[PDB]
Amino acid sequence: XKKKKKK
Amino acid sequence: XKKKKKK
Amino acid sequence: XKKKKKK
Amino acid sequence: XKKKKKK
Amino acid sequence: XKKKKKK
Amino acid sequence: XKKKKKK
Amino acid sequence: XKKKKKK
Amino acid sequence: XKKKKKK
Amino acid sequence: XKKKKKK
Amino acid sequence: XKKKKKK
Amino acid sequence: XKKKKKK
Amino acid sequence: XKKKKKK
Amino acid sequence: XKKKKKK
Amino acid sequence: XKKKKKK
Amino acid sequence: XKKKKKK
Amino acid sequence: XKKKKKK
Amino acid sequence: XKKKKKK
Amino acid sequence: XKKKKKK
Amino acid sequence: XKKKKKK
Amino acid sequence: XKKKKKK
Amino acid sequence: XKKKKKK
Amino acid sequence: XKKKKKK
Amino acid sequence: XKKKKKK
Amino acid sequence: XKKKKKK
Amino acid sequence: XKKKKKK
Amino acid sequence: XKKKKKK
Amino acid sequence: XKKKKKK
Amino acid sequence: XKKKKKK
Amino acid sequence: XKKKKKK
Amino acid sequence: XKKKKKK
Amino acid sequence: XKKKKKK
Amino acid sequence: XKKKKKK
Amino acid sequence: XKKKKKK
Amino acid sequence: XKKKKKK
Amino acid sequence: XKKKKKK
Amino acid sequence: XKKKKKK
Amino acid sequence: XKKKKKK
Amino acid sequence: XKKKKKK
Amino acid sequence: XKKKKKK
Amino acid sequence: XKKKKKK
Amino acid sequence: XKKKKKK
Amino acid sequence: XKKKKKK
Amino acid sequence: XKKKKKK
Amino acid sequence: XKKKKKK
Amino acid sequence: XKKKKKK
Amino acid sequence: XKKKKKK
Amino acid sequence: XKKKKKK
Amino acid sequence: XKKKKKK
Amino acid sequence: XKKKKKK
Amino acid sequence: XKKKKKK
Amino acid sequence: XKKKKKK
Amino acid sequence: XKKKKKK
Amino acid sequence: XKKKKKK
Amino acid sequence: XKKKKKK
Amino acid sequence: XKKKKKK
Amino acid sequence: XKKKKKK
Amino acid sequence: XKKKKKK
Amino acid sequence: XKKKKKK
Amino acid sequence: XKKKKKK
Amino acid sequence: XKKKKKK
Amino acid sequence: XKKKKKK
Amino acid sequence: XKKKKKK
Amino acid sequence: XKKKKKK
Amino acid sequence: XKKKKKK
Amino acid sequence: XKKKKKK
Amino acid sequence: XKKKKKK
Amino acid sequence: XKKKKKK
Amino acid sequence: XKKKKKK
Amino acid sequence: XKKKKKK
Amino acid sequence: XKKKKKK
Amino acid sequence: XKKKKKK
Amino acid sequence: XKKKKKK
Amino acid sequence: XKKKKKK
Amino acid sequence: XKKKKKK
Amino acid sequence: XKKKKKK
Amino acid sequence: XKKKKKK
Amino acid sequence: XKKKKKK
Amino acid sequence: XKKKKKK
Amino acid sequence: XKKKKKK
Amino acid sequence: XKKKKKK
Amino acid sequence: XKKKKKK
Amino acid sequence: XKKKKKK
Amino acid sequence: XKKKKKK
Amino acid sequence: XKKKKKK
Amino acid sequence: XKKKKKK
Amino acid sequence: XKKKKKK
Amino acid sequence: XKKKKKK
Amino acid sequence: XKKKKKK
Amino acid sequence: XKKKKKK
Amino acid sequence: XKKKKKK
Amino acid sequence: XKKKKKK
Amino acid sequence: XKKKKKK
Amino acid sequence: XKKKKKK
Amino acid sequence: XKKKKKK
Amino acid sequence: XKKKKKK
Amino acid sequence: XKKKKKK
Amino acid sequence: XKKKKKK
Amino acid sequence: XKKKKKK
Amino acid sequence: XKKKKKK
Amino acid sequence: XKKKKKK
Amino acid sequence: XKKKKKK
Amino acid sequence: XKKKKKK
Amino acid sequence: XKKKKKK
Amino acid sequence: XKKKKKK
Amino acid sequence: XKKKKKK
Amino acid sequence: XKKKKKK
Amino acid sequence: XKKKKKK
Amino acid sequence: XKKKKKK
Amino acid sequence: XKKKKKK
Amino acid sequence: XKKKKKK
Amino acid sequence: XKKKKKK
Amino acid sequence: XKKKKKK
Amino acid sequence: XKKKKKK
Amino acid sequence: XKKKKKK
Amino acid sequence: XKKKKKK
Amino acid sequence: XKKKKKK
Amino acid sequence: XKKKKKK
Amino acid sequence: XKKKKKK
Amino acid sequence: XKKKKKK
Amino acid sequence: XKKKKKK
Amino acid sequence: XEYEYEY
Amino acid sequence: XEYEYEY
Amino acid sequence: XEYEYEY
Amino acid sequence: XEYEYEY
Amino acid sequence: XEYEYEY
Amino acid sequence: XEYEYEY
Amino acid sequence: XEYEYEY
Amino acid sequence: XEYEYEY
Amino acid sequence: XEYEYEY
Amino acid sequence: XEYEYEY
Amino acid sequence: XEYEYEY
Amino acid sequence: XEYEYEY
Amino acid sequence: XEYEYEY
Amino acid sequence: XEYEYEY
Amino acid sequence: XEYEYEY
Amino acid sequence: XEYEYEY
Amino acid sequence: XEYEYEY
Amino acid sequence: XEYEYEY
Amino acid sequence: XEYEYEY
Amino acid sequence: XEYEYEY
Amino acid sequence: XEYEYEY
Amino acid sequence: XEYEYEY
Amino acid sequence: XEYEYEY
Amino acid sequence: XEYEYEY
Amino acid sequence: XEYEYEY
Amino acid sequence: XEYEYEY
Amino acid sequence: XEYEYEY
Amino acid sequence: XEYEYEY
Amino acid sequence: XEYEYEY
Amino acid sequence: XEYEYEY
Amino acid sequence: XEYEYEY
Amino acid sequence: XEYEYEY
Amino acid sequence: XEYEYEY
Amino acid sequence: XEYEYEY
Amino acid sequence: XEYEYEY
Amino acid sequence: XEYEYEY
Amino acid sequence: XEYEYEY
Amino acid sequence: XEYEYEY
Amino acid sequence: XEYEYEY
Amino acid sequence: XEYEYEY
Amino acid sequence: XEYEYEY
Amino acid sequence: XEYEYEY
Amino acid sequence: XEYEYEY
Amino acid sequence: XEYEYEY
Amino acid sequence: XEYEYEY
Amino acid sequence: XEYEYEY
Amino acid sequence: XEYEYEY
Amino acid sequence: XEYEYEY
Amino acid sequence: XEYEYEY
Amino acid sequence: XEYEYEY
Amino acid sequence: XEYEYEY
Amino acid sequence: XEYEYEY
Amino acid sequence: XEYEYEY
Amino acid sequence: XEYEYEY
Amino acid sequence: XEYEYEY
Amino acid sequence: XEYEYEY
Amino acid sequence: XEYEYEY
Amino acid sequence: XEYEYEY
Amino acid sequence: XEYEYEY
Amino acid sequence: XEYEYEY
Amino acid sequence: XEYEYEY
Amino acid sequence: XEYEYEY
Amino acid sequence: XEYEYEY
Amino acid sequence: XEYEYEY
Amino acid sequence: XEYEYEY
Amino acid sequence: XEYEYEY
Amino acid sequence: XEYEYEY
Amino acid sequence: XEYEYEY
Amino acid sequence: XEYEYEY
Amino acid sequence: XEYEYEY
Amino acid sequence: XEYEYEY
Amino acid sequence: XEYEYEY
Amino acid sequence: XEYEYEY
Amino acid sequence: XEYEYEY
Amino acid sequence: XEYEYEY
Amino acid sequence: XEYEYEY
Amino acid sequence: XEYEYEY
Amino acid sequence: XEYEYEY
Amino acid sequence: XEYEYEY
Amino acid sequence: XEYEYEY
Amino acid sequence: XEYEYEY
Amino acid sequence: XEYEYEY
Amino acid sequence: XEYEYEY
Amino acid sequence: XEYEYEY
Amino acid sequence: XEYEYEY
Amino acid sequence: XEYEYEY
Amino acid sequence: XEYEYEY
Amino acid sequence: XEYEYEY
Amino acid sequence: XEYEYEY
Amino acid sequence: XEYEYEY
Amino acid sequence: XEYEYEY
Amino acid sequence: XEYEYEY
Amino acid sequence: XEYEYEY
Amino acid sequence: XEYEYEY
Amino acid sequence: XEYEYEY
Amino acid sequence: XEYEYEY
Amino acid sequence: XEYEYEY
Amino acid sequence: XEYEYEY
Amino acid sequence: XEYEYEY
Amino acid sequence: XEYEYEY
Amino acid sequence: XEYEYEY
Amino acid sequence: XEYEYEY
Amino acid sequence: XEYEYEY
Amino acid sequence: XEYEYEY
Amino acid sequence: XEYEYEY
Amino acid sequence: XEYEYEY
Amino acid sequence: XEYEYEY
Amino acid sequence: XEYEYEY
Amino acid sequence: XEYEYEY
Amino acid sequence: XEYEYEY
Amino acid sequence: XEYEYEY
Amino acid sequence: XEYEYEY
Amino acid sequence: XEYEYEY
Amino acid sequence: XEYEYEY
Amino acid sequence: XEYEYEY
Amino acid sequence: XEYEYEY
Amino acid sequence: XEYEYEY
Amino acid sequence: XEYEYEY
Amino acid sequence: XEYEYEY
Amino acid sequence: XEYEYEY
């Protein structure tokens, strides 16, 4: 598996 | 697997 | 696998 | 796999 | 696979 | 696969 | 596959 | 495949 | 495939 | 395929 | 394919 | 294919 | 194909 | 194809 | 194709 | 094709 | 094609 | 094609 | 084509 | 084509 | 084509 | 074509 | 074509 | 064409 | 064409 | 064409 | 054409 | 054409 | 044409 | 044409 | 044509 | 033509 | 033509 | 023509 | 023509 | 023509 | 013519 | 013519 | 013519 | 013529 | 013529 | 003529 | 003439 | 003439 | 003439 | 003449 | 004449 | 004449 | 004459 | 004459 | 004459 | 004459 | 004459 | 004359 | 004358 | 004358 | 496995 | 496994 | 396993 | 295992 | 005449 | 005449 | 005449 | 005549 | 005539 | 005539 | 005529 | 005629 | 005619 | 015619 | 015619 | 015609 | 015709 | 016709 | 026709 | 026709 | 026709 | 026709 | 027809 | 027809 | 027809 | 027809 | 037809 | 038809 | 038809 | 038809 | 038809 | 039809 | 039809 | 039809 | 039809 | 139809 | 239809 | 239809 | 239709 | 349709 | 349609 | 349609 | 459609 | 459509 | 469509 | 569509 | 569509 | 679409 | 679409 | 689409 | 799409 | 798509 | 897509 | 995608 | 994707 | 992806 | 990905 | 990925 | 990844 | 990764 | 990674 | 990694 | 790593 | 690492 | 004569 | 004468 | 005569 | 005569 | 005559 | 005659 | 005659 | 005649 | 005649 | 005749 | 005739 | 005739 | 005739 | 006739 | 006839 | 006829 | 016829 | 016829 | 016829 | 017829 | 017929 | 017929 | 017929 | 027929 | 028929 | 028929 | 028929 | 029929 | 039929 | 039918 | 039918 | 039908 | 039908 | 039908 | 139908 | 239908 | 239908 | 339908 | 439909 | 449909 | 549909 | 549809 | 659809 | 659809 | 759809 | 769809 | 879709 | 989709 | 999609 | 998608 | 996706 | 995705 | 993804 | 991903 | 990922 | 990842 | 990762 | 990681 | 890591 | 790490 | 007367 | 006367 | 007367 | 007367 | 007368 | 007368 | 007358 | 007359 | 007359 | 007349 | 007449 | 007449 | 007439 | 007439 | 007439 | 007429 | 006429 | 006429 | 006519 | 006519 | 006519 | 006509 | 016409 | 016409 | 016409 | 016409 | 026409 | 026409 | 036409 | 036309 | 046309 | 046309 | 056309 | 056309 | 066309 | 076309 | 086309 | 087309 | 097309 | 196409 | 196409 | 296409 | 395509 | 395609 | 494609 | 494709 | 493809 | 593909 | 592919 | 692929 | 692939 | 692959 | 692969 | 692989 | 692999 | 592998 | 491997 | 391996 | 291995 | 191994 571009 | 472009 | 463009 | 353009 | 342009 | 232009 | 232009 | 122009 | 112009 | 101009 | 101009 | 101008 | 002008 | 002007 | 002016 | 002016 | 003016 | 003015 | 003025 | 004025 | 004025 | 004034 | 005034 | 005034 | 006034 | 006044 | 007044 | 007044 | 008054 | 008054 | 009053 | 009053 | 009163 | 009163 | 009163 | 009263 | 009263 | 009363 | 009363 | 009463 | 009463 | 009463 | 009573 | 009573 | 009574 | 009674 | 009674 | 009674 | 009774 | 009785 | 009785 | 009785 | 009885 | 009886 | 008896 | 008896 | 790009 | 790019 | 790139 | 790149 | 001197 | 001297 | 001297 | 000297 | 000298 | 010298 | 010398 | 010398 | 010398 | 010398 | 010499 | 010499 | 010499 | 010599 | 010589 | 010689 | 010689 | 010689 | 010789 | 020789 | 020789 | 020889 | 020989 | 020989 | 020979 | 021989 | 022979 | 022979 | 023989 | 033989 | 034989 | 034989 | 035989 | 036989 | 036989 | 037989 | 037989 | 038989 | 039979 | 039979 | 039968 | 039968 | 039967 | 039957 | 039947 | 039947 | 039936 | 049936 | 049926 | 049926 | 059915 | 069915 | 069915 | 079914 | 089913 | 099913 | 199922 | 299932 | 299942 | 399951 | 009374 | 009374 | 009374 | 009374 | 009274 | 009274 | 009275 | 009165 | 009165 | 009165 | 009065 | 009065 | 008055 | 008056 | 007056 | 007046 | 006046 | 006046 | 006046 | 005037 | 005037 | 004037 | 004037 | 004038 | 003028 | 003028 | 002028 | 002028 | 002018 | 001019 | 000019 | 000019 | 000029 | 010029 | 020129 | 020129 | 030129 | 030129 | 040139 | 040139 | 040239 | 050249 | 050249 | 050349 | 050359 | 050459 | 050459 | 050559 | 050669 | 040669 | 040769 | 030769 | 030869 | 030969 | 030969 | 031959 | 032969 | 032969 | 043969 | 043969 | 010589 | 010489 | 010589 | 010589 | 010689 | 010689 | 010789 | 010789 | 010789 | 010889 | 010889 | 020989 | 021989 | 021989 | 022989 | 022999 | 033999 | 033999 | 034999 | 034999 | 035998 | 035998 | 036998 | 036998 | 037998 | 038998 | 038997 | 039997 | 039997 | 029996 | 029986 | 029976 | 029975 | 029965 | 029964 | 019964 | 019954 | 019953 | 019943 | 019942 | 019932 | 009922 | 009911 | 009911 | 109900 | 209901 | 309901 | 309801 | 409801 | 509801 | 709801 | 809801 | 909801 | 929700 | 939620 | 939430 | 949340 | 949260 | 949080 | 937080 992911990319989690939180904010 | 995902991309999670939260915000 | 997805893209989740939340907001 | 999808794109989920929520909002 | 889909596009789900919710809202 | 579809496009689901909900709203 | 379809387009589903709901609303 | 169709187009479903519901509403 | 059709077009279904419901409403 | 048809067009179905329901309503 | 037809056109079905129901109503 | 026809046209079916029902109603 | 015909035209069917029912009603 | 005909025209069928029923009613 | 004919015309059928029924009624 | 004819015309059939029934009724 | 004829004309058939039945009735 | 003829005319048939039945009745 | 003739005319047939039956009745 | 003739005329046939039957009746 | 003739005239046939039967009856 | 003649006239045939039968009856 | 003649006239035939039968009867 | 003649006249034939039969009867 | 003649006249034939039979009867 | 003549006259033939038979009978 | 003559007259023939037979009978 | 003559007159022939037979009978 | 003459007169022939036969009989 | 003459007169022939036969009989 | 003459008169011939035969008989 | 003459008169011939035969008989 | 003359008179011929034969017989 | 003359008179000929034969017989 | 003359008179000829033969016989 | 003359008179000829033969016989 | 003359009179000729032959015989 | 003359009178000729032959015989 | 004259009178000729022959015989 | 004259009178000629021959014989 | 004259009278000629021959014989 | 004269009278000529020959013989 | 004269009278000539020959013989 | 005269009278000539020859012989 | 005269009278001439020859012979 | 005169009278001439020759012979 | 005169009378001439010759011979 | 005169009378002339010759011979 | 006169009378002339010659011879 | 006179009378002339010649000879 | 006179009378002339010549010879 | 006179009478003339010549010779 | 007179009478003339010549010779 | 007179009478004249010549010779 | 007178009478004249010449010679 | 007178009488005249000449010679 | 992931990338977690928090902030 | 991960990368955790906090801040 | 990890990398933890804090700050 | 890790790397901890604090600061 | 005569003379007749009557009375 | 005569003379008749009557009275 | 005559003379008749009556009276 | 005559003479008749009546009266 | 005559002489009749009546009266 | 005659002489009749009446009156 | 005659002489009649009446009156 | 006669002489009649009436009157 | 006669002489009648009336008047 | 006669002589009648009336008047 | 006669002589009638009237008047 | 006659002589009538009237007037 | 006659002679009538009227007037 | 006659002679009538009127006037 | 006659002679009538009127006038 | 006659002679009528009027005038 | 006659002679009428009027005038 | 006659002769009428009027005038 | 006659002769009428008018004028 | 006649002769009418008018004029 | 006649002769009419007018003029 | 006649002859009319007018003029 | 006649002859009319006018003029 | 006639003859009319006008002029 | 007639003859009309005008002129 | 007639003849009309005008001129 | 007639003949009209004009001119 | 007629003949019209104009000219 | 007629004949018209103009000229 | 007629004939028109113009010229 | 007629004939028109112009020229 | 007619015939028109122009020229 | 007619015939038109021009020229 | 007609015939037009031009030329 | 007609026939047009030009030339 | 017609026929046009040009040339 | 017609026929056009050009040439 | 027609027929056009050119050439 | 027509037929065009060119050449 | 037509037929075009060129050549 | 047509037929084009070129050549 | 047509048919084009070239050559 | 056509048919093109080239060659 | 066509058919192209080249060669 | 066509058919192309080349060769 | 076509068919291309080359060769 | 086509079919290409080469050779 | 096609079919290519080469050879 | 195609089919390529080479050989 | 294709099928390639080489050989 | 293909099928390659070589050989 | 393919199938390669070599040999 | 492929299948390679060599041999 | 592949399958390689060699032999 | 592969399968290699050699032999 | 592979499977190598040699033999 | 592999499996090597030799033999 | 491997498995080597030799034999 | 390996497994080596020799034999 | 290994396992070596020899035999 | 003589003066004869026969009384 | 003589003066004869026969008394 | 003589002067004869027969009284 | 003579002067005869027969009284 | 003679002067005869028969009284 | 003679001078005859028969009285 | 003679001078006859029969009185 | 003679001079006859029968009175 | 004779001079006859029968009175 | 004779001179006859019957009076 | 004779000179007859019957009076 | 004769000169007859019957008066 | 004769000269007859019946008066 | 005769000269008859019946008066 | 005769010369008859019936007057 | 005769010369008859009935007057 | 005869010369009859009935007057 | 006869010469009849009925006057 | 006869020469009849009824006048 | 006869020559009849009814005048 | 006869020559009838009814005048 | 007859020659009738009714005048 | 007859020659009738009704004049 | 007859020659009728009604004039 | 007849030759009728009604004039 | 007849030759009728109604003039 | 008849030859009718109504003039 | 008839030859009718109504002129 | 008839030959009708209405002129 | 008839030959009608209405002129 | 008829031959109608309305001229 | 009829041959109608309306000229 | 009819042959109609309206000229 | 009819042969109509409206000229 | 009809043969109509409107010229 | 009809044969219509509108020329 | 009809054969219409509008020329 | 109709055969229409609009020329 | 119709055969329309608009030329 | 129709056969339309717009030329 | 129609056969349309717009030429 | 239609057969349209726009040429 | 239609067969459209735009040429 | 349509068969469109735009040429 | 359509069969479109744009040539 | 359509069969499009753009050539 | 469409069958597109862009050639 | 479409069958696109860009050639 | 499409079948794209870019050739 | 598409079947793309770029050739 | 697509089936891409870049050839 | 795609099936890419770059050949 | 893709099936990439770079050949 | 991809299936990459670089060949 | 990918299946990489670099061959 | 990847399956790498570098061959 | 990767499965690396370097062969 | 990786599975490395360097062969 | 890695599984390293260096072979 | 690694599994190292150096073979 | 007397016996008278006047010598 | 007396016996008278006047000598 | 007397016996008278005047010598 | 008397016996008269005048010698 | 008397007995008269005038010698 | 008298007995007269004038000698 | 008298007895007259004039000798 | 008288007894007259003139000799 | 008288008894006259003129000899 | 008289008894006249002129000899 | 008289008794006349002229001899 | 008279009794005349001219001999 | 008279009794005339001219001999 | 008279009694005339001319002999 | 007279009694004439010319012999 | 007269009684004429010319013999 | 007269009584004429010309013999 | 007269009574004429010409014999 | 006359009574003529020409014999 | 006359009574003519020419015999 | 006359009464003519030519025998 | 006349009464003519030519026998 | 005349009454003609030619026998 | 005439009454003609030619026998 | 005439009354002609040719017998 | 005439009344002709040719017998 | 004529009344013709040819018998 | 004529009334013709040819018998 | 004519009235023809050919019998 | 004519009225023809051919019998 | 004609009225033809061929019997 | 004609009225034809062929019987 | 004609009115044809063929009977 | 014609009116044809073939009976 | 024609009106054909074939009966 | 024609009006055909084949009966 | 034609109006065909085949009955 | 034609109007065909085959009955 | 045609109007075909096959009945 | 045609209008076909097969009944 | 055609209008086909097969009934 | 065609309009086909198969009924 | 066609309009096919199979009913 | 076609419009097919199979009913 | 076709429009197929199988009903 | 086709539009298929199987109903 | 096709539009298939199987209903 | 196809548009398949199986309903 | 296909668009499949199985409903 | 296909678009499959199994509903 | 396919788009599968199993609903 | 496929897009599978199992709903 | 596939996109699997099991919902 | 697959994208599996089991929801 | 797979992307597994078990939700 | 797999991406496993068990949620 | 796998990426395991057990959440 | 695996990346295990047990959360 | 594994990366184990037990959280 | 493993990377174990037990948190």
Numbering used by the authors:
A (entry chain B), B (entry chain B), C (entry chain B), D (entry chain B), E (entry chain B), F (entry chain B), ...: 1 to 7
Give passages from the manuscript.
Although the same-charged peptides cannot self-assemble, oppositely charged peptides form heterotypic nanofibers. pmcThis Communication reports the first cryo-EM structure of heterotypic assemblies formed by intrinsically disordered peptides and demonstrates their context-dependent assembly.
We selected EYEYEY as the main negatively charged peptide for interacting with KKKKKK due to its presence in human proteins, such as MAP3K5, albeit without an experimentally verified ordered structure. Testing all possible indexed symmetries established that the nanofiber has C2 symmetry, with a helical rise of 4.68 Å and a twist of −4.22°, featuring parallel cross-β packing and six hydrophobic pyrene rings in the core. The remaining residues of the third peptide were flexible and disordered, revealing a disorder-to-order continuum and demonstrating unexpected conformational heterogeneity in heterotypic intrinsically disordered peptide nanofibers. Moreover, analysis of the atomic model revealed multiple hydrogen bonds between tyrosine and lysine, and we have seen side-chain densities from the cryo-EM map to support those side-chain conformations. K1 forms three intermolecular hydrogen bonds with Y2 and Y4 from the same peptide and Y2 from another peptide, and tyrosine also forms an intramolecular hydrogen bond between Y2 and Y4. The conformationally disordered Pyn-EYEYEY and Y6 from the ordered Pyn-EYEYEY should allow hydrogen bonding with additional Pyn-KKKKKK, which explains the postassembly bundle formation. To verify this, we also synthesized Pyn-EFEFEF to interact with Pyn-KKKKKK and found that postassembly addition of Pyn-KKKKKK was unable to form well-defined bundles.
